[PDB]
């Protein structure tokens, strides 16, 4: 486990940005990794994407 | 390049069990560059989805 990483629940973080759109969020963070292929990068944000969708619809 | 992702699964990409996990899985990927940026790139992305579910 890499304990940096600490489980993110649902609601907006501090000290992070927020973009316009998921599309905008995308833009910003290939800027940030810009190396490293499309492919491994949309594993990487749509593989968080989806965890997130399925933490928030659980939820009550 | 990219289009805007509905808040609603994506049957061609994974999911995991937590957002610590999901977190994890993307570290593996881009393992590279500093804490900073990678949280930057992933809680950005984070707090826009949040929002546009949230209302
Ligand atoms: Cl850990
Ligand atoms: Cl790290």
């Not at 649902?10 to 800027?31: G, I, M, W």
Request: glycine share 6%.
């Amino acid at each position: 486990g890499m304990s940096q990483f600490q489980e993110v629940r649902p609601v907006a973080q501090a000290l992070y940005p927020t973009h316009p759109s998921t599309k905008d969020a995308l833009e910003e963070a290939r800027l940030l990794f810009p190396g490293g292929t499309h492919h491994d990068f949309m594993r990487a944000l749509m593989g968080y994407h989806n965890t997130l969708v399925k933490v928030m619809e659980e939820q009550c």
